[PDB]
Amino acid sequence: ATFISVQLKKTSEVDLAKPLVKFIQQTYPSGGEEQAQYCRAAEELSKLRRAAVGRPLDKHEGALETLLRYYDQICSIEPKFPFSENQICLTFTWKDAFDKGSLFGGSVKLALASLGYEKSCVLFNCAALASQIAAEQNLDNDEGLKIAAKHYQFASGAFLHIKETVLSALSREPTVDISPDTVGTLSLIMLAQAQEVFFLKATRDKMKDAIIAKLANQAADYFGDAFKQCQYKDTLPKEVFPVLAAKHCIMQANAEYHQSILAKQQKKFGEEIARLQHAAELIKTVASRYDEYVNVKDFSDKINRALAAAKKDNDFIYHDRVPDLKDLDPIGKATLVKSTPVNVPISQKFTDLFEKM
């Protein structure tokens, strides 16, 4: 199993308190003892930023809920200080998730006095960490599967929320990592892996071959489209394009392999052989082109075992004509997977720290 996940964006420590302590008294007069409610609490928010975006990470629900909490919070803090005319002074500096920068002095950074920019990069890290948690799941068990599928669909919907949002939300030209192109592609990647997780669930549950083939066929589409978005781009890490190329073929081969079990079941022995020849050809291409990225050995053997048996008996007994691929019916497509919309609150049991403001 070879799953793609995204590295978290770096940020630098900022004193979120100082710049907000000030902009709290206006025609809210209480300069006596009342304002200090919106202050011990407006730096529970500051230590929350440091917890959310501050340490090297736990890849568990612990660290993820903190990031989600922090995202919920900034979204709620937005209109309090009417930020259509921004006059709170705060500058958030984030490093590009992907761009190295030349070792001709330093990385690729962007500093912006914006809540827009902040909530964007935070949601990036929520999506990215969720992708990391998904990829670490043990897929040999049902709850491993359930958690990977849940988080891949979350990360897909969250990268996609950034796509439709970064440009309006920000003033400047985004870094390439959060720009709509990169993030539309990450979103598709996550959605493809979520679909793969469903195929892997049908496979564990030894569900019907017709079903597994339609799940596999839809995954091949998602992976196909994602690699096409990366063909002419070198934004994402180098392993990404070859992994997506290989899984587009592996998923096509799974579709053909399972649809071939259905053929055999229905005594269409020539169609069985034709589908299995396709599957072996796909897997042979992956084995020779992408082998430093995937191990396709057991599957290749399994196909080659079914093909050999099918051919012996067709040549000896049935003498069905092996049809041409273009004369076979298309395998269907079954999608079981959506980009999860971002609707604050996204964190579990959220309470707004500034709810009475």
Binding site: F198, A202, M207, K208
Partner: peptide, 18 residues
């Protein structure tokens, strides 16, 4: 097709229980 109910449905339930 009486199991393509029984299989598709039980993943649409796995799905909603997320």
């Amino acid at each position: 097709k009486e199991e393509e109910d029984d299989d598709m449905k039980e993943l649409e339930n796995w799905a909603g229980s997320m």
